[PDB]
Amino acid sequence: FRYTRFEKARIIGARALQIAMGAPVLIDVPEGITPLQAALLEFEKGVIPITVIRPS
């Protein structure tokens, strides 16, 4: 199972939107970064909680 580019972009956008209006970061992040950068760091760390629903 691998994420597509569209699925990864949607997950990152949803996580950044969540971080913008709450949803504290689950990992340590450097100060002064954007919520998009925090979501990208979370994805790089493999800590994202958002899953993808696929047709079956």
Nearest approach, Cβ of residue 12 and another protein (Å): 4
Nearest approach, Cβ of residue 18 and another protein (Å): 9
Token pair of 12 as six digits:
């990152």
Residue 49 binds another protein, judged by CB under 8 A: no
Phi–psi pair at 44, nearest 5 degrees: -65, -40
Q: Nearer to another protein by C-beta: 46 or 56?
A: 46
Question: Going by C-beta distance under 8 Å and a sequence separation of 6 or more, which residues neighbour residue 43?
Answer: 8, 11, 12, 15
Q: How far is CA 32 from the centre of its chain?
A: 18
Name the residues that contact another protein, by CB under 8 A.
5-6, 8-10, 12-14, 16-17, 19-20, 35-36, 39-40
